[PDB]
Every structure is written in structure tokens, then in C-alpha cells.
Amino acid sequence: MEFAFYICGLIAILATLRVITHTNPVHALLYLIISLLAISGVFFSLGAYFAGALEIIVYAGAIMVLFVFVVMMLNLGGSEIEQERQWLKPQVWIGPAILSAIMLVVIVYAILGVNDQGIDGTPISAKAVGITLFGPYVLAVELASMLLLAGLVVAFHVGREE
Amino acid sequence: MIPLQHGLILAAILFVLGLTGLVIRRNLLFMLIGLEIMINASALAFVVAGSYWGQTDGQVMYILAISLAAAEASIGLALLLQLHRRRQNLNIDSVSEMRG
Amino acid sequence: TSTEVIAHHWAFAIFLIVAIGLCCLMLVGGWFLGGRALSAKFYLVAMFFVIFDVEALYLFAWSTSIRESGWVGFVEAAIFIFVLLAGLVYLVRIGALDWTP
Amino acid sequence: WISPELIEILLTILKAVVILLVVVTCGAFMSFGERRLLGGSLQLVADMIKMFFKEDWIPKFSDRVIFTLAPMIAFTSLLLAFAIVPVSPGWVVADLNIGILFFLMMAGLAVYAVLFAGWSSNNKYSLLGAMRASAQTLSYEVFLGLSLMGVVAQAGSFNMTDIVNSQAHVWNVIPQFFGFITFAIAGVAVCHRHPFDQPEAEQELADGYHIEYSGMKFGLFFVGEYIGIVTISALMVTLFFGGWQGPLLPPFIWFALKTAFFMMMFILIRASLPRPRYDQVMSFGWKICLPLTLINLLVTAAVILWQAQ
Amino acid sequence: MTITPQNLIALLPLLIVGLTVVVVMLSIAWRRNHFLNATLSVIGLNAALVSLWFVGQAGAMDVTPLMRVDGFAMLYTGLVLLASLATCTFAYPWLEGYNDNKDEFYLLVLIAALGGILLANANHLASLFLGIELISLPLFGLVGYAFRQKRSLEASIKYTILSAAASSFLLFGMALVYAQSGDLSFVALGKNLGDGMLNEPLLLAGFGLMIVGLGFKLSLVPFHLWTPDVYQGAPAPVSTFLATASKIAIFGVVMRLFLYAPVGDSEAIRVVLAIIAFASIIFGNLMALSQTNIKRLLGYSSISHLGYLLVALIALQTGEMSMEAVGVYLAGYLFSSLGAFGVVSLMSSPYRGPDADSLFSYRGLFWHRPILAAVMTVMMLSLAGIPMTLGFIGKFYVLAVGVQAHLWWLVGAVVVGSAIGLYYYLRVAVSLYLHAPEQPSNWQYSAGGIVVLISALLVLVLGVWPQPLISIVRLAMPLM
């Protein structure tokens, strides 16, 4: 239950590292789906079963389908960027990578030194998440519906063809 | 048996890589991809924090996070479609009309 | 840490591994053997699927705990479902979901 | 090296692999049954030999990874979605607490086969046709889950064996008739079955995504298609028709009889019910089936909370 | 806990705005009518204000583990609803000049008002996050409502990408905080610490990332660069809403978070916010020096005024009168921004199409629009902290609060930034009255003019006699 967590975390890290340093959009989305599967494996290794279930049902099964759908619709076949590839020349990526490494080392220094009994991995089932969702989190559910309705309206208003 | 610090470090690494891909990539689709990596890394951090404390609040936070991620994905891809429609180009540096 | 749960874990692992290995090995046998010689309504329907799938996941979480939430949870989910149906009726009536205008 | 935990885990491994081989062989047998009704095993073996030894050709202007990955998805998605179905007491592959949620993950991954095949087939008409097909499958996967959620509400949990045990007295086809018909429609739509076989037939700027797939990848698509309807029929049995529960016959016999009956019913409504239009399919889905699932879930919740003393 | 009927009558503004959203959506689905849907939206927002009165007839209590309703929530709910009503009134003629659908605007204004009310009542990290997103997403739609324009579409893209980055930063911050402290409530962030161990590195890191997200949302330096481009590119009623309601609601939830959290009295966070406020005041006032566009000028103005508010926030847990200082300043700044952006919207209405320019050209405005020139020079004087105006009363409040807590660097920053503000505000106010070489008739345009006239008169009278506003704000005290 720990070996699965470490191997899935390593797979997720390597997959998003390949995502941010790739040029083909479909390959980037495929490696992104691979990392989402890995992070769902991370969730299942921790006992958050419902989180992994919604990770593959929705994140790697609805949102990334929309990203792939848009990629095929706009038909990116080397529109002046696949022939340039600025993110491989060092003057574009060394600076932001240095800044990100500094932020990572600051956050990691914050993480260490914090008391840790370990993660038990006890399965928090979907019925407990459902009880909490419609119990002490009622307005969160109703206004998450309101938020998704707002997103529906704005995405229709922008993206319609006419 | 799994330390909380290791899960949080993994989430921080994913967030850092997502922000790196958000910054260094000029293409707007890859900015949206980096945004998805960042919000999913934050949701993973919330799930790890909930799983350490044994509370159901982490997965509820995950659910709210992915609802926001889906709606902002819809906005990002609709705006990407409108940009590709009116400019035939996904250039995020070129359409920069208002400046100081 | 019973023998039944570890037996089921190993059985599930063997099922997944043998299934993916069977597909991969049969593709490998196929490749190795044998001699040689757009419209924006699609975005609209995918976006609607994404949004309605997230509201579906909310109902997924609700349905497994209908007994424990009582009538108050029924009222909350009825408000949720009514907002969802109002959005669906709005999309249908203003022509978002009409495929042939 | 003799101990009965090792013996038990080897027996469960044997049960899982036996289930897997029976599923793939029943899918191949259904492929031949549909080919014939519209030695037999010798003819299937000869077909498999032809698909093995024909050259697997990849287009030069096509991505190799996506083209190779689409039939693997079309097979393995529902072939792994079968793993939650209990065919007999003590003969279930995995007793997951997520269950039909795991089935929903596999359906959501199954749409990637159509999308990947359409993109890797370097053709505008094939891309448009597969994009219409993926739009239809999304439009029916939007309510597949809720059509199952009615039964989850009645059983009170996501586990498969718990649903089967709640089907001890009355099978949920009788209370959840609308959930049953919506699940049947969405399952027949997800696996690309008739009526919704080829949505590109309504327009000549679109072509099928099965074209440019030749030989063994085409065979992967075919066998995965029939395996997908194997597991759709088995899930329909275990969610609406008692699973393995029956009065006289042994439980596996009852499950096999129900699954075979739904298999021939799917063959029959391939053979009988004609072709609707594409906009008719979209309108029917988005304007009938999803509100039907929502109203059925509300009525199910009201009935459950009414019958709670 | 469960929701009692007393909690439900405390829920009345949220429920009324949600029912208004549903009713407006169903009216759009019936028939696309601009006038009926505008009337329905303004009726729902006015009913939400009367519902605020009925909430005050009830008590103050914690309706959810998520929401807490008190006079704080009432005051911020009233400010957000007034900003939303003004946005609808200004947006009606601008939408009368529009070609496409013009009721989704009112739908989005209602949803963003709902998010503002939720941020007013927010007592939870989940509630804070959900209110921020419910403000942001309708603003994503409204900023790019004229998506055919170049400026509006790029403002929409900039706001979308940067706010998604800010929301991810904020969410990771609360993830780190929930990793440190086992509860997500406001009152329990740092509760399990003692003997001076409030400076937990993980809690400080989490609160820093939430500081990044909120400092984007409040246009604070160095997360301020988005402000003038989005303010200029957006439609003028959207600029009105984005300057008033979003800033008011997000700053209210920031104040409530820093008041309730035991980690609010941490010297590290206090010094970091002091640096952010100093930089915000100085940078906004310096950058608005050489601006010819009124909307970018008002964006840098918003940066400086939020810096003044943040200065009032730094003295939250040392003084006592910080709450009423922020309330008075926010009422004055709301009315000032409403008047200024309303004049801008009234001379940019009706809409001239995606091809025609939307420049204001304020020079010589008195010679053809004398009333709007008088209103805008009143609002420009009010934004400068000039006496006989309410913005001076808020300025004096901020100065008193900073002096009381011995924040001398911030007091000097307010003095210097007010001098720079004097320069550019009086430049605009006297450019209104010069001579211009060159470069309506409906009751809704008159309604918008009446709105800005009433805002200017309120600013003048409450600058002369600020006691009723102080009395109203002082009884709007949150739970102790």
C-alpha cells in the first residue's frame, strides 16, 4: 500500500514532466491522462476511494476528453510554434525553472519539520463523503451547482458558433 | 505507514511542474494544461491532508476543486476557440494590445 | 490483513496484468508475424457533458447515502436537481442543444 | 511450500483467469453468432490465424502510438469493467466498494478509443465521423451513471454483491423500469451498437473510424466490441435481474441463462429496429433520457425515505 | 449541523438571489426579452436588500459549519447588492446598444452577487474558496461579454488565466493549512499551538499562498499587473462591478479570516502584509501619474485604495476601531467608484459595435454634459481624500487607525500616495472643465444618471455629516 503510492507518485511526476516539455498536443494530453491515472492510484493507495473514482470518471474522463476534443477541432499541425520550440532553448526555461526550484525548496522546507504520525490508509468510503457533502456542507453543494451553471452559461456565450 | 510529508512533497512537486509549464509555454493550450496540472496538484494536496487526519473534508474539498477545474476548463477552451476563430493563431504574446 | 482481502487483491492484480498482457502480447504477435510487401456544436455538447457529469458526480455521492441523510437531504438534492433541470431546459429552449437549426 | 493461504490465493487467481478466458471466448463466439445469424470454432480459429498473419500496416502520415493505443482501449476498457461482476458466490474477481463507479471509469476511458482512432486516422472525413460518434457517446454517458444511481439508491451502496443481495426478493427491473430502460439505451449507445451503429451515415463529409484499421487491430476493435456488450449484458443482469439468484437452478446457471438471453436480445434489436437520424439521437438523449434519470432518482429517494420507519 | 427554520430566515439574501437566477433563466428560456429580464434581476436584488432587513429582524448565528451571519455579513451583503444593482442599471443602455444575447449579462451579475453574499457570510475555507470562484467565473463571462472586440477578449483571457493561477495558489495554500491544522474552520487555524509556537512553517507557508491568491483578487502588489488591462478592456458596467463588488466582498472575507484566525496575530504575516500595503500604495499612486485612459487610471487608483484598506487591516488585532474604519472607507470607496465608473459607462452607452472605438474623451465634458461633469469632478475629489467628501472620511479613518497602532511607515506611505493621487485626480477633474474642439432619450439612461447623481450627493452629504454612516457601520459588528 506504500509501494503502490511511491510508484504511482513517481509515474505521475515523470508523466507531468514529460507533459510540460512536449510539443505534440495529443501526446501531451495522453501523458496527462497517464498522470491522472497515476494520481488516482495515489488516491486509492491512501484510502480516499471516492477521490480516485472521481479522478478517473471526471478528470481523466470528462475534462481531458474536452481538451482532446478541442485539440482535434482546432487541428494543431505545427502552427509556427512546433517549428520554433522556444522552451527547449535555455534562455526561455532556465529562469522559470530556477524560480520554480526555489519555490519548491521553500515549500519542501516548510513541509519538513512538521509532526507526522503517518497516513493510516484506512478507506474513507464514498458514503461518508456523501454524508458529509449533504450534511455539514449543504450550501457548498448548492452553490457548486450554481458555479457549474455559471460556467455553462459563460462557456456557451463565448464558444457558440453563430 | 505512508508519511504525510511525502504526499505533500509529491503534491508540491506536481504544482511546481504545472506552474513551470504554465510559464515557459507560449501556446495557450499548454497554459491551460499547466493550469489543470496546478489545480489537480492542489486537489491532491487536499486529499492527502484529509487522509492524514481521517476526515471526509479533504474529499469534499477535492470535489469542489474539480468542479471549479471543469468550469474553468470550459472557459479556457471556449476562449481558446474564440481566439483561434478571430485570429487563426494561438499566440498569447501577439494579442497584447493594452499595455502600460 | 485477512487472507480473503489479500487473495482478492492478488486476483484483481492478476486479472489486470493478464488482461493488459494478453492485449499487448496479441498485438505483438500480430505485428511480429506475417510477411511484408470544424463546427462548434461539438464543443458545446462536450462542454455540456463535462458540466452535467460533475453535477452527476454530486448525485453519485448523494445516492449512496439517501437513508442516512433523511428528508432534509432529499430537499437539498431536489433543489440541486431543479437547478440542473432549469439549466437543461434553458439550454434546450434557447437552441444550444438543437442539433439541426 | 504447502500452506492454505497460498492455496487460497492460487484458487482465487485461477478463478479470475477462468473468468477472463470465458469472457473473451464468449465474446468471440458472439462475434461468430452475429456473423452467422445475420466446425464453427474452427472457422473462428481460421479467422484469428488470418488476422495474425496478415501484415499489420500503419499509415506513414499517422501517429504510431495513438493508432496502436486506440484498439487496446476499445478492448481493455470494458474487458476490465467486467471485473466487478459477481458470476457466482465466491467467484467474483474483485469485491470493490466502488463497483459500478469502476464501471463508470472504464466507460469514460472507453470513449478515448473512438477519439484516438479518429485522430490517428489521418483523414478529415474519418475525423469528422469519429467526432460525431464521440459526441453521441458523451451524450449517452451523461446519463448512464444516473440510470445506475437509481439502483445504488435502492441498494444503499456501490458494492456489487450488496446490490445482488438487495435483489433477493424483488429484482430491480420491476421498481426501476425507467432506470432499466435508460441503462439499456445508454449501454447500447456506449458500445456503438444498433440503432446508433454508424452516425456518419447521415452525411457524406464523414467516414467511419474503423476504416484504415486492418488486420489484427481491426480484430481488437471487433473482439473488444463484443466483449463490451458481454459485460454490459452481465452488468444489466447483476443490476436488474437478480444476478445469480434464482429458485431452482444453480446460481452460475441462472446467471449464464440471463446473460445469454440479453445477448440474443441485443442481437435481435440489431436485426430489427431501424436507423434514426443523428439529430434525432441527440435530441432524444439530451431531452428525454437525462431528465428521466433525474425524475426517477427523485421518485426513488421519495419512496425510500417514505418506507423508512 | 442541520438547518433550522431560523437558519433559513437567516438565509434570505442567498435564497432570494438564487431564486432570482432560476426565475431569470426560466424567463430567458421562455422568450428572449431584455426589459423583462432586467426588471426581474433588479427586482430580485432589491428583494435581497429587503431580505437583509428581515435578516436583521432576526439574530446573528452560525448557519452551517460554513456560514456565520452577523452585522458584518449584513454590511458587506448590502454593499455587494448595491454594487450589483448599479451594475445592472449602468448595463441596460450599454446592452441596448448590443447585438447578441443581452440577458446572460444579468444572469452573470446575479451569480456574481450571490458569490459576493457568500463571501460576506463565509466562516470556512470551503466557503471562502467557493465565494471567490462564484465571484470570478461570471466575471470571466462579463469581462469578455463583447468577445468580438480585441480589448475585451484579451482582458477575458488575461483575467481567466491569472485567476485560475491565483485560485490554484489559494487552494494549495488552504491544503497546506488543513495539513497543519486539522480543521478547516476560520476559528481553528493555528488553534493547536502554544508557548509562542504560532509561527509554524507549514501554516505560514499555507497562509502565504492564500495571501498570493487574495492579493491577486485585491489587486495588491506584486499581483497587481492584471488590473489596468482588465479594467480597460472590460465593458464599463463590468469595470464598475469588478472595481466595487469583487473588491468589497473579497476584502470583507479577508478581514473576517484575519479577525477570527489565531494566526492572524503573527508578526511574520503582519510584516509581509505591511510590505505589501506599502508597495501597493506607492506603486499604484506612482503608476497612475501619466495615464491618459480613465479606466487604467481608475485601475491604479483601485490598487492604491486597496493598499489603504490593507493598511487598515494590518492594525486589526492591535486596535479596536479597524472594523468601522474599513466599513466607512469601503462605503465611501464604493460610492466613489460607482459614480466614476457610472459616468464612464453613461458616456460609453449605448454600445457602438465591436469595430468602433470605446474611448471616453473626458476633455470638455461640461460643455455638453454638465451634470455628469459635476458628478465626476465630485467623485475625483472624493477619491483624492479631499475634505467635504466621504473618501476623506475613510482616509481620516485609515490614518487614525494607522497612528493608533504606531505604523509610521504606513502613515508616511499614505501621506505620499495621497500627494500623488492629488496630482492625477485633480488633473482629471480640471481636464473635465477645459474646452474641447470636437468629440439617450430613454428613461433607463435617466435612471443611470439619477444613480450617479444620488451617489455624488450621498458622497457630499456624508462628507459634510459623516455621523449616520459611522453609526450604521458601528452596529455592524461581527461575533466577538
Ligand SMILES: CCCCCCCCCCCCCCCCCC(=O)OC[C@H](COP(=O)(O)OCCN)OC(=O)CCCCCCCCCCCCCCCCC
Ligand atoms: C512495477 C514497476 C513499474 C512498471 C510500469 C508501471 C505499471 C503500473 C505501476 C503502478 C500500478 C501498480 C502498483 C502496484 C500495486 C500492487 C498492489 C498493491 O500494492 O496493493 C496494496 C494496496 C491494497 O489495498 P489496501 O487494502 O489499502 O492494502 C492494505 C494491505 N493489506 O493497494 C492500494 O491501496 C491501491 C493500489 C494502487 C491503486 C490501484 C492501481 C493504480 C494503477 C495506476 C496506473 C497508472 C498508469 C501506469 C502506466 C504505466 C505505463 C506508462
Ligand SMILES: CCCCCCCCCCCCCCCCCC(=O)OC[C@H](COP(=O)(O)OCCN)OC(=O)CCCCCCCCCCCCCCCCC
Ligand atoms: C499500457 C498500460 C497502461 C496502463 C494500464 C494499467 C496500469 C496498471 C496495471 C497493473 C495493476 C496492478 C494491480 C493494482 C492493484 C489491484 C488491487 C487493488 O486495486 O486493490 C486496492 C483496492 C482494494 O479495495 P478493496 O479490496 O475493496 O478494499 C480493501 C480495503 N482497503 O482497490 C481499488 O482501489 C480499486 C481501484 C483501482 C483500480 C485500478 C484499475 C486500473 C486503472 C488503469 C486502467 C488503464 C486502462 C488502459 C490504458 C488507458 C489509456 C492510457
Ligand SMILES: CCCCCCCCCCCCCCCCCC(=O)OC[C@H](COP(=O)(O)OCCN)OC(=O)CCCCCCCCCCCCCCCCC
Ligand atoms: C523642507 C523639508 C521638510 C518638510 C517637507 C514638507 C512636505 C510637504 C510640503 C512640500 C511638498 C512638495 C511637493 C513638490 C511637488 C509639487 C507638485 C508639482 O510640482 O506638480 C507639478 C508637476 C508637473 O509640472 P510639469 O513638470 O510642468 O509637468 C510634467 C507632467 N507632464 O507635477 C509633477 O511633476 C508630478 C507631481 C506628482 C505629485 C506631487 C509630488 C509628490 C512627492 C511627495 C510629496 C510628499 C513629500 C514628503 C517629504 C519629502 C522630503 C522633503
Ligand SMILES: CCCCCCCCCCCCCCCCCCCC
Ligand atoms: C428529519 C425530517 C425533516 C422533515 C422536514 C424537512 C423539510 C424542512 C427543512 C428543509 C431545509 C432545506 C434547506 C435547503 C437549503 C438550500 C440552500 C440553497 C442555496 C442556493
Ligand SMILES: CCCCCCCCCCCCCCCCCCCC
Ligand atoms: C456469458 C457468461 C460469462 C461467465 C463468466 C464467468 C464464468 C465462471 C464459471 C464458474 C463455474 C463454477 C461456478 C460455481 C459452481 C456452480 C456451478 C457448477 C456447475 C458449472
Ligand SMILES: CCCCCCCCCCCCCCCCCCCC
Ligand atoms: C462642493 C462640490 C465641489 C465639486 C463640484 C463642482 C461642480 C459644480 C457644478 C458645475 C459648475 C462648473 C462651472 C465651470 C465654469 C467654467 C468657466 C470657464 C470660462 C471662464
Ligand SMILES: CCCCCCCCCCCCCCCCCCCC
Ligand atoms: C517613494 C515614497 C516613499 C515614502 C516613504 C515615507 C516614509 C515616512 C517616514 C517614516 C518614518 C519611520 C520612523 C520609524 C521609527 C520607529 C521607532 C521605533 C521605536 C521602538
